[PDB]
RNA sequence: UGGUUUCUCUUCAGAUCGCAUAAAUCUUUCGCCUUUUACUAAAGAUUUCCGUGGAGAGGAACAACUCUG
RNA sequence: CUCCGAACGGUAAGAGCCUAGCAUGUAGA
């Protein structure tokens, strides 16, 4: 057991570091497929039309 | 794991320091 | 009849009229106890002197 | 043969009352106060004009954008109307002194669309660099970056049964980005299109969706495909639908094909007409939204003529 | 029925809440203008700050002096 | 008749040598 006592830090100060360069989440995603419709040819004549 | 306690920090502290 | 009395007197009642004209809000708020969070921290104390 | 076919839905035909034309350019958002009284609708000449939405004579015209405005979302929850241009600033154009009252930013390009949500105080300003903005209102500041779209977000919906927010993005891919969180909890297996429709029905039903291309239904608790739309193969770009069970489709075509939110058959199906200063094929009905009243169906075309469309009844529509 | 004070925190303020009165921002106007900020003040509405008003919660001082009824 | 202005738009450009008022408060054996 180890009891979680926010310090009170000083309400005046300015900040304690710079701005902060550090990855905060990962850059790959969940990439959730489409699963929309077959795509397929139109018809012969629709590279004409 | 973590996992937190609803007990009180006053008799907490005193019981494990005695 | 003052030359400095005249336009001293113009001015001052100007600045009385023009932050009474359009100077007359309803004044809401709805924050207070600005000075009084630091006195509730753990650094700052209060005193007399 | 088909399922619920020898019982539809009951759809009498509507008919143009008043062809109101007062704009200069192509109108590209119509919206009605919740009053019944005023009648929003901005235009291509970066004006958005008001008018009466009953008499349909001229009530204000207010200008401020440095583009197109290609959006007006009237608050009904606070006396702000709201607007959306394509210069890169929400011009939130409060009504209660006809000025620019908070003049947010943050998107880095034009914004498609603006929706007000109902009970949470902010607006969804759905842009179309890269994603969709939640702009805090009478905060003058962002709540998070909702980037979920491989696309402009064109469409926009903020209801408050439906717990994340139904953002139509023109990739083919529909998705629910969550308030708090920001990511998409359900992306849409359908719309091969770009979407860029969506619409709502709280009256019996979920909230629907849309497609310029094989578009369909859906449903609000984490999305279910009910049925697909009829045959329109247009430019869909206006989606309205009414609580008396009607769906009207604005496409980009100047077919404005008119169908059951129920049924799915098309009811009436008719072609508007154009201005006699416009071209041949220049009418399209670039937004649509029924009245307060919802007795006079408002269509705002791209011949610069917003078109209103009254009721008649008939009962010899009947459909096979 | 029964408490004069004082300090902390929770709302709405449409009362000259302020018997007095600052700054910034936004949309329109004038004067100079030579790049710009510092500029001049007329109108309107949005914040911040100097402050305040009733009504529940927790400590200290005689709460007991017995206040109105 | 007594209404009083401030900054930027400004000193360059470089070679070799020389000296300075500054800052952090660690885990480790």
């Not at chain 3, 630091?38 to 650094?43: H, I, N, S, V, W």
């Not at chain 4, 590209?28 to 958005?48: H, K, L, M, Y």
């Not at chain 4, 109902?118 to 939640?134: E, G, H, K, Q, W």
Request: net charge positive; glycine share 6%; proline share 6%.
């Amino acid at each position: 057991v180890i009891r979680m006592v926010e310090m009170q830090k000083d309400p005046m100060e300015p900040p304690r570091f710079k701005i902060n360069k550090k990855i905060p989440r990962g850059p790959p995603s969940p990439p959730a497929p489409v699963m929309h419709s077959p795509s397929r040819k139109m018809t012969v004549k629709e590279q004409q039309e | 794991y973590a996992e937190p306690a609803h007990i009180n920090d006053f008799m907490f502290e005193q019981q494990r320091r005695t | 009849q003052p030359v400095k009395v005249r336009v001293s007197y113009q001015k001052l009642l100007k600045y009385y009229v023009l932050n009474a004209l359009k100077h007359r809000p309803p004044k809401a708020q709805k924050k207070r106890y600005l000075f009084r969070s630091f006195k509730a921290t753990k650094f700052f104390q209060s005193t007399k002197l | 043969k088909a399922p619920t076919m020898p019982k539809p839905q009951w759809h009498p035909p509507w008919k143009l009352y008043r062809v109101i034309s007062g704009h200069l350019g192509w109108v590209r958002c119509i919206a009605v106060e919740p009053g019944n009284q005023w009648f929003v609708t901005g235009s291509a000449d970066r004006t958005i004009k008001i008018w009466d939405l009953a008499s349909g004579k001229l009530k204000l015209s207010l200008t401020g954008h440095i583009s197109t405005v290609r959006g007006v979302i009237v608050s009904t929850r606070s006396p702000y109307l709201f607007s959306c241009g394509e210069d890169k600033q929400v011009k939130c154009w409060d009504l209660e002194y006809n000025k620019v009252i908070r003049h947010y930013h943050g998107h880095l390009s034009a914004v498609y669309g603006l929706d007000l949500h109902p009970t949470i105080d902010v607006l969804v300003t759905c842009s179309r660099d890269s994603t969709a903005r939640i702009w805090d209102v009478r905060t003058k500041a962002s709540v998070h970056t909702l980037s979920g779209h491989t696309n402009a977000v064109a469409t926009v919906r903020c209801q408050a049964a439906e717990p994340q927010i139904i953002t139509g993005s023109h990739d083919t891919t529909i998705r629910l980005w969550d308030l708090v969180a920001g990511k998409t909890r359900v992306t849409l297996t359908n719309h091969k299109k770009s979407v860029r429709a969506v619409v709502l029905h709280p009256r019996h039903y979920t909230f629907a969706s849309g497609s310029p291309d094989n578009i369909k239904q859906w449903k609000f608790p984490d999305g279910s495909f009910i049925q697909n739309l009829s045959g329109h193969n247009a430019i869909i770009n206006t989606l309205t639908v009414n609580s008396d069970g009607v769906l009207v489709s604005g496409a980009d075509n100047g077919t404005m094909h008119l169908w059951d939110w129920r049924t799915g058959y098309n009811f009436q199906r008719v072609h508007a007409a154009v201005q006699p200063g416009s071209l041949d094929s220049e009418s399209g009905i670039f937004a649509c939204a029924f009245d307060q009243s919802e007795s006079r169906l408002l269509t705002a075309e791209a011949d610069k003529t917003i078109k209103v469309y009254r009721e008649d009844d008939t009962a010899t529509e009947e459909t096979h």
